[PDB]
Structures are given as structure tokens and as C-alpha cells.
Amino acid sequence: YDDPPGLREKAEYLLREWVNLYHSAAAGRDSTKAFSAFVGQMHQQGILKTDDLITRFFRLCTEMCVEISYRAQAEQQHNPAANPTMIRAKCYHNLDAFVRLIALLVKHSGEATNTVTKINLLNKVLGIVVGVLLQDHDVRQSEFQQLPYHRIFIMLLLELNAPEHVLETINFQTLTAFCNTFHILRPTKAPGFVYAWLELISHRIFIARMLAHTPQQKGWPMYAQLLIDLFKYLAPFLRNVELTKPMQILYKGTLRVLLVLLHDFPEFLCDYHYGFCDVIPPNCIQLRNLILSAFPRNMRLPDPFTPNLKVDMLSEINIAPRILTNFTGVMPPQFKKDLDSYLKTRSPVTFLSDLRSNLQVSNEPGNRYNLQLINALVLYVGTQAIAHIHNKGSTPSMSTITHSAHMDIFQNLAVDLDTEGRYLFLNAIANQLRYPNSHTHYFSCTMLYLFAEANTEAIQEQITRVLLERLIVNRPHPWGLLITFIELIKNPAFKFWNHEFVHCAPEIEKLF
Amino acid sequence: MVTDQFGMIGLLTFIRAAETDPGMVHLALGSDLTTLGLNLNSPENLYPKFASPWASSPCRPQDIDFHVPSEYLTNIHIRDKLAAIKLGRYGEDLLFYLYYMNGGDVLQLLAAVELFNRDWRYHKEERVWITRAPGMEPTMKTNTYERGTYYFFDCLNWRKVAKEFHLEYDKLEERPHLPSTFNYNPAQQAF
Amino acid sequence: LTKEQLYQQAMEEAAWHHMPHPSDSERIRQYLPRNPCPTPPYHHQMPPPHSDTVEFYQRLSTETLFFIFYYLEGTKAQYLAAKALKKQSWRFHTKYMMWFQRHEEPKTITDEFEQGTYIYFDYEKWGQRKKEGFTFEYRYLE
Numbered sequence: 001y002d003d004p005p006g007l008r009e010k011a012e013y014l015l016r017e018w019v020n021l022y023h024s025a026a027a028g029r030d031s032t033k034a035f036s037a038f039v040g041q042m043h044q045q046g047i048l049k050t051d052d053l054i055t056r057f058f059r060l061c062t063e064m065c066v067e068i069s070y071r072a073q074a075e076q077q078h079n080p081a082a083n084p085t086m087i088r089a090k091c092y093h094n095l096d097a098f099v100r101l102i103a104l105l106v107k108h109s110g111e112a113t114n115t116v117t118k119i120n121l122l123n124k125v126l127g128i129v130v131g132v133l134l135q136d137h138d139v140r141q142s143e144f145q146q147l148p149y150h151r152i153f154i155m156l157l158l159e160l161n162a163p164e165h166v167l168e169t170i171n172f173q174t175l176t177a178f179c180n181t182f183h184i185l186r187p188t189k190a191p192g193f194v195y196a197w198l199e200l201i202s203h204r205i206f207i208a209r210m211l212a213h214t215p216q217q218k219g220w221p222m223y224a225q226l227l228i229d230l231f232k233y234l235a236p237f238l239r240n241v242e243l244t245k246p247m248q249i250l251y252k253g254t255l256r257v258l259l260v261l262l263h264d265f266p267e268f269l270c271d272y273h274y275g276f277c278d279v280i281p282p283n284c285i286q287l288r289n290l291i292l293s294a295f296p297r298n299m300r301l302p303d304p305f306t307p308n309l310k311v312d313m314l315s316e317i318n319i320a321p322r323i324l325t326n327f328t329g330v331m332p333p334q335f336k337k338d339l340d341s342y343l344k345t346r347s348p349v350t351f352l353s354d355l356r357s358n359l360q361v362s363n364e365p366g367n368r369y370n371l372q373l374i375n376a377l378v379l380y381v382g383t384q385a386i387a388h389i390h391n392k393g394s395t396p397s398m399s400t401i402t403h404s405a406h407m408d409i410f411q412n413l414a415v416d417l418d419t420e421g422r423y424l425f426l427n428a429i430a431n432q433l434r435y436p437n438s439h440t441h442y443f444s445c446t447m448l449y450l451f452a453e454a455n456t457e458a459i460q461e462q463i464t465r466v467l468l469e470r471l472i473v474n475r476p477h478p479w480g481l482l483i484t485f486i487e488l489i490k491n492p493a494f495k496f497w498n499h500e501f502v503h504c505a506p507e508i509e510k511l512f
Numbered sequence: 513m514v515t516d517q518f519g520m521i522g523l524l525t526f527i528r529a530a531e532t533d534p535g536m537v538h539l540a541l542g543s544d545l546t547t548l549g550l551n552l553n554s555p556e557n558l559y560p561k562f563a564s565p566w567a568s569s570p571c572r573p574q575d576i577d578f579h580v581p582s583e584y585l586t587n588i589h590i591r592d593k594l595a596a597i598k599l600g601r602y603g604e605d606l607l608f609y610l611y612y613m614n615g616g617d618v619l620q621l622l623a624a625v626e627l628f629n630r631d632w633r634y635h636k637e638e639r640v641w642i643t644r645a646p647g648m649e650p651t652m653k654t655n656t657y658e659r660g661t662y663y664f665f666d667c668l669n670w671r672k673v674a675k676e677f678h679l680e681y682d683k684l685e686e687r688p689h690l691p692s693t694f695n696y697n698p699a700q701q702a703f
Numbered sequence: 704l705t706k707e708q709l710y711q712q713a714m715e716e717a718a719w720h721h722m723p724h725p726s727d728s729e730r731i732r733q734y735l736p737r738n739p740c741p742t743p744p745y746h747h748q749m750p751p752p753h754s755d756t757v758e759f760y761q762r763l764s765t766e767t768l769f770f771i772f773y774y775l776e777g778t779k780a781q782y783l784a785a786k787a788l789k790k791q792s793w794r795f796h797t798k799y800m801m802w803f804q805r806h807e808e809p810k811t812i813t814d815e816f817e818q819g820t821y822i823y824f825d826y827e828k829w830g831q832r833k834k835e836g837f838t839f840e841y842r843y844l845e
Contacts, residue, residue: 025588073721080694085736088724092731142717150723158730163579191714196723203728204562204571212559236708243535244712246719248703251538253565259545264557286542419518458514465520472527473542500513501520507527508520549749561755564725569749574771575737576779577730583845584785586800587733587776594773595829597734605764615748618738624746636745667751670762691740698739699722 003056010045011060017041019097035104051124058128061098062152066136068094069148095151103159107166119173122160126181129153137190150196153181154203161205172218175209179222187233194233194250201226202257211265221324224272230254231279239281258290262476269294273434274325274379278372282427285473293476295435302436304482313436318395320386321437323379330376339377343384346405352412360421369424378428381406386442396442398449410446415455422459426466433480440480447484452494461501464488535703566699572613599626608641612667616698624688632665634685638677641665645674657681734774755779760787765831769802769824797843801826806833816840 021034042048047057069091076087102125110117129152137144160167160174167174182201187194200206201223210219234254237247262269269276273291280287295301302312310317328336335358342351359377360369385406389396401407413425429450432443447463454460467485471477488496489512496502503509516522523540530540537543549568550558561570587594599607599622607630611623624634632643642664650660657680666673704712726737742748753759760768760783768791771784785795793802801823809819818838825832 027588028582076695084695085738088726089731089736092726096731142714144714144718145721146718146723147721147727151727154728155730158577187715188711191711192718194715195718196727198565199723199728202562202565204559207559207562233711236704237712238538240704241536241539243538244716245535245703246715247712248535249566249699249719249722250715252702255543255545256548256550256565256567259548259550259552260559260562263550263552263554264559283539286538286545289542419514419516423518458519461514461519465514465518465523468520469523472523473540474544475546504513504520505524507524564728566722567725572750572780573755573783574735574775574778574780575729577777578779578782580777580782580785581845583795583797584772584781585776586773589800590773590826593827595827597774601829602770603764603766606767606770609763609767609770612747613750613754615746615750616739616742618740619735620742620746621740634746639745639747667747670759685745693741695721696739696741697722697724699725700719 003060007053007056008060010047011057012064014038014042014045014047014057015061015064015098018101019094022097022100023093031104035108038101039108055124055128058102058125059132061101062129062132062148065091065094065098065152066132066148069145073145073147091147091151095148096155099152099155099159102156106160112166115170115173118166118170119177122174123177123180126177130181130184133185133190133193137192141192144192146193146196149193150199153178153196153200157200157203157206161209171209172214175214175219176222178206179210179226182226183229186229188229198230198250198253198257201230202253202260207260207264211261211268220268220271224268224275224324227272228275228279231276235279235281238284255286255290258287262290262294266294267296270296270435271322271324273431274323274327274375277431278325278327278375282371282424285470288431289470289473289476289478292431292434292478292481295479299435301479304479304486307483307486310441316436317438317441319437321434321439327376327379330372331380339380343381343388343405346408349408352408352416355409356413356416356421369421371424374421374424375428375431377409378425379432381409382432382439382442382446386438396438396445398445401442401445402449407446407449410450411453414450414459419458419462422462423466426462430466430470430481430484433484434478435480444480444484444487448487448494451488457499457501460499464496464499464501564699566702568698568702569615574613599623602626604630608665608667608670611641618690621688621690628687633679635677635679635683636685637683638664640667642677642679648674650679730777733776757783757786757790760784761790763787765791765824769826772802773826794839794844796839797845799823799843803834803837803839814841816842 018038021038024030024034026034047053072087072090076082076084106118106121106125109121129149133149157178161171182197185193185197187197190197207223210223234247234251237243238251243251258269269291273294276291277288280291299316331339335355338351338354342348355377359373361373362368385401385404386396388404388406389400394400414422417425426447429443429447432439433447434440447467451460451463454463467481467488470481471485488494501508502512513519514521517525526536526540530537546552549570550562551570558570561576563569563571563575599610602610604627607623607626611620611627614620614623627634627641630643632641634640635642642662645661645663648661648663650658652659657678659676659678661674661676662679663672663674664677665671724737725739726732729737760771763771763784765788768784768788771780772788775781775784788795788802791804793804795802803821803823806820806822809817811818816838817840818836820833820835821837821839822831822833824830
């Protein structure tokens with residue numbers, strides 16, 4: 001009922017024959033002749049008659065390659081004495097053949113200027129392989145293997161990134177197709193394909209094409225989305241204390257790719273830090289340190305070791321950072337309405353308690369606080385406060401950020417929340433302590449002021465806990481963070497050493 | 513004083529726990545990133561030589577599919593006439609090349625075996641290949657060691673250099689052994 | 704963990720048993736495939752620094768360069784090796800598919816072809832052979 005009878009035999013014959021031709025003594029011209037002849041026979045077999053039969057053809061070929069891979073692996077397991085190199089060489093044989101066929105079909109689809117047909121065929125084949133992957137994953141489960149799909153995807157990617165004009169004119173749509181493909185194949189959607197998936201993202205030519213060669217940084221949003229998917233998958237396991245070996249390796253890999261992105265494309269991590277932090281768990285210090293340490297290339301950071309004043313960066317303090325993530329949309333319309341209303345009229349005062357009730361939506365087990373809503377609240381209120389101060393006629397200082405509706409929220413959330421809430425809150429504040437700008441300065445002053453005019457000693461203990469925690473770990477360390485922490489120690493206007501938590505444990509006391 | 517893990521107590525307990533278990537370091541002290549394969553202190557990019565998320569070393573020139581002229585590709589033409597790969601009939605230069613370039617591979621071990629056949633011995637501590645020098649006999653010869661001028665291979669300058677050594681037989685390696693691990697994958701142990 | 708997340712962890716644990724091989728990403732190496740193995744710590748786990756430069760390939764012996772050229776087809780290694788050969792005054796022939804060097808200045812030199820006595824590397828016997836009165840046509844050079 002699936003396919004018309006005899007179709008699988010046609011597909012098998014054609015595929016096998018193309019496998020024979022591809023590895024045959026064939027150079028460029030020979031490949032052109034063999035391709036023309038093969039397309040001819042393909043027409044003659046009545047396959048390219050309709051899009052349906054084409055879909056069936058590609059699907060059958062894909063499934064055949066997959067089953068060949070499975071047979072190879074089973075053969076390897078039953079006979080461990082067999083050379084694994086040849087076992088891999090069979091899969092490589094058939095898969096490379098099929099991939100080359102696909103690439104050649106895409107390249108010569110329609111006329112030279114006919115990019116639409118080529119792209120449509122690309123998304124067609126890709127979608128087909130994706131469907132086969134999902135079906136195979138759903139039916140085999142633990143028996144699922146990634147080798148065929150992995151090789152197909154990466155080899156097709158390499159084939160379509162070849163240095164030729166036709167592929168160059170459609171490069172962006174190609175990268176788009178591969179991006180959509182990789183998004184549909186999310187680790188939360190296809191767990192057993194995770195490793196290869198990462199290798200599909202962190203691959204050198206894909207990173208090069210997405211973040212470097214693509215002009216106007218148009219590839220940045222898509223890659224950012226893929227990274228967000230990875231972080232989403234990693235989040236629930238990283239939040240847990242114990243971490244299994246698979247998760248450990250996946251995490252190490254993530255560290256490596258993130259290190260690469262940090263060293264080569266700091267502006268990318270800089271422009272999209274908010275979403276990443278909005279996905280990454282607060283207890284993961286290294287990742288957030290990799291992301292918060294990102295800052296533009298042209299900027300030269302002042303020495304944090306021996307600071308003279310804020311006059312060295314005074315030209316960059318008035319410069320507002322860039323947030324390519326709509327955080328205001330996270331907030332419910334009514335909540336945002338009341339928020340702006342209070343930020344405008346500073347009334348009523350009950351809005352604080354109502355707000356605290358509004359950011360701990362307890363309707364699902366495990367999670368007690370809407371972290372994203374907290375981050376959104378902190379960032380929005382902060383930016384609004386900066387705007388208000390600037391519109392007033394002055395710049396945000398230690399004395400200019402005080403006694404406002406914006407500060408009332410911070411104070412209230414600081415004193416009228418439990419340890420968890422204030423933990424997430426202070427993390428939300430510390431996430432803005434980065435390279436010299438308006439945000440890092442305002443939130444540094446905010447953090448320090450919250451420490452100073454603190455009701456209980458517990459709040460101070462929490463602030464010190466955060467600022468220290470983000471500095472005990474290995475490099476890298478965010479600039480604004482380090483500065484903000486230094487201000488707690490250097491300036492005697494806080495009486496830091498007079499507190500009890502500093503003299504709590506011998507290890508802690510010896511740490512300072 | 514905070515009576516939870518959100519205070520300094522939770523932090524110190526996390527430090528101790530991370531000092532105990534290595535699989536819990538992601539939350540506490542974190543791992544040294546400079547110990548990883550890539551070089552963080554490089555003026556140029558490192559992504560074009562980025563192999564895999566689990567690679568402990570950057571790409572080798574023999575791992576980069578560069579676009580060579582069509583005249584260079586001859587494997588399809590001479591797949592029948594080209595001589596097979598025999599380590600025995602190669603020069604020591606080629607042997608050293610196959611040793612140093614193919615790290616973590618069986619080819620390094622095979623090259624090491626051939627070198628071992630050419631009366632070369634690998635010093636485990638000196639991390640270099642050492643052999644006898646022509647006309648040079650050791651000054652002192654004991655049952656545990658021997659010292660004198662020998663020939664070692666400088667890999668930095670890629671040239672055979674003479675140097676006086678104090679070679680202990682324990683520090684020297686016997687014949688290299690070949691693994692029998694079926695379907696071995698290093699990326700599996702990148703935890 | 705959620706039920707779904709436990710399923711994800713289990714699946715990842717399952718796929719961990721067969722992680723993608725390093726050779727799954729690169730084109731199929733015909734003569735020198737990547738065959739990983741437990742290498743002793745005292746041995747060099749990675750190649751020496753600056754081994755990606757052409758100057759590093761200049762230090763190599765000729766036989767090594769030919770080895771790289773013939774057994775590492777379509778790689779950067781073949782590129783660097785070929786560069787090192789050309790800088791060492793080695794001309795590559797198209798029809799015979801081998802490198803040649805002037806053993807001595809040829810008697811007859813024209814723009815059509817260059818006939819004389821040269822030396823070459825036989826890929827079949829793996830060694831250097833000398834050719835007398837060899838006509839090196841420029842129709843097979845690029």
C-alpha cells in the first residue's frame with residue numbers, strides 16, 4: 001500500500017548501478033557522460049514522471065543505504081575479527097555514491113539561472129532523509145545508528161560548498177535548508193542523533209559558511225537558534241548534580257565549540273548573550289563565563305588590576321549594548337502594563353507584592369520561579385531606569401539610580417524574596433556585568449548599592465556568594481563582574497570584612 | 513546567616529565535592545580550558561583547523577580536503593600499478609615523518625616498530641628517539657645503564673644530532689606492542 | 704529529570720556506545736585511513752608545532768614528499784608536498800603522472816618540447832630512475 005509494485009526493484013537497480021559508475025574509472029568528463037546516461041536511464045524507468053515517484057525513489061535509496069549500514073555494523077559485531085576499516089568502507093562506498101548523485105541532481109536541475117528548482121529539490125531530498133531518519137529513530141529506538149544519516153548530511157554539505165559559481169549563487173538558501181534540517185533534528189526531537197548533530201553544527205566549514213563567509217551577518221540568527229537548541233537540550237541535565245559520562249563528553253564538546261566561537265567570533269556571542277543566558281542554568285558558571293567574556297574586537301579593556309577611575313572608559317559608558325532578543329515580549333500584557341504604570345507614577349506600593357506573586361508561577365513541578373520572566377524584569381527595569389536618568393538630564397551614578405520607582409523593585413525583590421528567588425535575581429543582575437558599557441555600569445552600581453543598603457546580612461551574603469562564585473572558577477572571567485567584586489573589597493564604604501559570612505569557615509577566610 | 517546552599521556553605525561544600533568527584537566540577541571549580549587541544553593564545557583563527565568537539569588536537573594537513581589541481585589526482589589512474597605501502601623499504605626520514613605526524617594512530621606504532629628494527633630506542637623520559645653513533649662506544653657499561661655520546665633525532669630542527677646521554681635500560685622501551693581493541697574510538701573517552 | 708528527559712539520557716547513553724568515527728567526516732582515505740589506537744603517554748600524541756608550514760615540508764626528504772603526494776591524494780598535505788617539490792626544481796608530468804628533475808642541462812631546448820637527460824621517481828618500483836634522451840613536452844605541464 002506504500003509504494004506501487006516493482007518500484008523498489010527499479011530503485012535498487014538504479015542506485016546500485018550509480019554506485020558502480022561512481023567508483024568506476026571516471027574523471028570529470030567521464031562523470032558528465034555517465035551522469036547524462038544515468039539520468040537518461042532514470043527517465044526511461046519511469047521514475048522522474050511525477051514528484052511522488054521521485055520522493056519514493058529518494059526515500060527508497062536512503063532506506064537502502066541505511067539498511068546497508070546496519071548490515072555492515074551487524075556483520076562487524078558478529079565477526080569482531082573483521083577489519084573495521086573495510087566495514088566503514090562499505091558504508092562510505094554506498095553513501096558517498098548516493099550523496100554524489102544527489103549533489104549532481106541538484107546542480108543540474110533546470111537552467112543555469114533556475115535557482116528555485118535547485119533549492120526546491122534540495123529541501124525535497126533533505127526533507128525526505130529527515131523523514132526517514134525520524135521513522136528509523138522511532139522504530140529502532142535504542143537500535144538506532146547515526147552513521148548513514150551523518151555521512152549523507154555532512155558529505156552533501158561538503159559537496160554543496162564546492163568552489164563553483166552555481167553553488168555560490170544559491171549558497172545562502174543551501175545553508176538555510178541545512179539549518180532548518182538541523183533544527184528539525186533537535187536533540188530533544190532526535191536524542192540518539194545528538195553527537196553527530198553537534199558535529200554537524202561545530203563542523204569547520206559550516207561554522208565558516210555561517211559566521212564568516214555569509215555577508216551582513218545574516219547567518220547569525222540561525223546559528224544562534226541552533227545553539228539555543230543545544231543549550232535547551234543540555235539544560236535539564238546540567239542543572240542536576242551528577243553527570244553521566246555521555247553527558248560529560250557532550251558537555252566537553254560544547255565547551256570546545258563555545259571556546260572556538262569565543263576566540264573567533266566574539267561579536268556573535270556578544271550580540272546573542274541574553275538568549276543563551278536565558279536558556280543556560282544559573283549553576284553553570286563556565287558556560288556563562290564563556291558567553292559573558294565576549295566583547296567586540298576593536299575594544300581595548302582597561303586594566304582591572306590597577307584601576308584609576310571610570311574616566312578611561314567614560315566614552316564607552318554612555319554607549320548602550322545591543323540586545324537582539326525580544327525580552328519585553330516574554331512578559332504578559334497586563335503585567336507589563338502595570339509595570340510601566342508603576343514605573344511612571346510610582347503607585348501603588350502594593351504592586352511590589354503583586355509583582356513578587358506574579359514571578360513565582362507555581363503550576364508545574366520542579367520549577368518554582370519563572371526564570372525568563374525574572375531576567376526580563378531585571379533587564380527591562382534596568383534599561384528603563386537608564387533611559388529615565390538620561391532623559392532627566394544626568395548620567396546613572398551611585399546617587400542617581402537611587403530613590404526611584406525602578407530601584408523600589410530591586411530593593412523589594414532583594415528583601416522580600418526567599419533564598420532561591422534572590423539567587424535567580426542576583427544572577428540576573430550579575431549576567432549584565434560584562435564589557436564597559438551602560439548596562440554593566442548601571443548594574444554594577446545597582447549590585448553594590450544593594451549590598452550597601454541591605455536590610456539583613458543574608459542578602460549581602462548572597463551577593464558576595466554570586467560575585468565570588470563567578471570568580472572562583474577558571475578563566476575566562478567577565479570584566480564588569482571582576483570590577484564590581486573589586487569594589488566590594490577596595491572601597492571601605494561597604495565594611496565588607498566586618499561581616500560574619502567572611503569569617504564563617506576557615507577555608508573561606510583563607511580564600512580572601 | 514543563610515542556612516541554605518545558596519550561601520557560602522553551599523559553595524564550600526561544592527568545592528569539596530568537586531575536589532572529590534571529577535564529574536561534578538561543572539558546577540563548582542570548573543575545568544582548565546588551556547589543557548584542551550586548541551590554542552587559546554593564537555593571533556589567527558583556529559576554526560579552520562577545528563576537527564571535532566571531542567578532538568584533543570587540531571587538524572593535520574593530511575586531514576584537510578584541499579582543492580588540488582586535477583593533474584595531481586592520479587589515484588584513479590594508478591590504482592593498479594602504484595606500489596603497496598611497505599614500511600620496510602622506506603628511509604628513516606619517512607619513518608620519522610610517519611611517526612610524528614600520525615600520533616594516536618597505528619601508523620605511529622608501526623613506524624616505531626620499524627625504527628626499533630633500525631636499532632633505534634625510544635627514551636620514555638627524554639621523549640626522543642636515540643640510536644648508536646658511528647664509531648662511538650659507551651664510556652661506561654653496567655648491567656643497569658650505560659653512558660656516552662649517542663645519536664638522537666631532533667624533531668624541532670628535523671635533523672639527527674649527537675649528544676651525550678646517561679641511558680638507563682629501564683628508561684628505554686622494548687619492542688612496541690600492537691593493540692587488539694575492536695572498533696576503538698578515542699572520542700568515547702573524552703569525558 | 705522528566706520522563707522524556709530520562710528517555711533522552713537513555714538514548715544518548717545508547718548512542719554513546721557507537722560515537723561517530725573521525726573518518727566519518729572526511730572523504731574516504733584510500734591508502735592511509737585513520738585508524739585510532741591506545742598510544743602510550745610517553746609517545747607523541749600530537750605532531751610537532753609548525754608542521755603545517757611549507758618550510759617544515761622543505762626539511763623533508765624527497766621520498767617522503769613523493770609518499771605524501773601519492774598516498775595523500777586531494778589533501779593539503781599533497782598541496783604542501785607538491786609546493787616543496789616544485790621549489791626543489793621538480794616538474795610534474797601529466798601523461799606519465801610523475802615528477803622530473805634535470806640531471807643535466809638538455810641539448811635541445813624549444814618551446815614545443817624539451818628533450819634531454821633527466822631523473823624521475825617510479826611509483827611502481829618506488830625509487831629514482833634515470834631517463835636518457837627523454838622528450839619532456841610542454842603539452843603535458845600545468
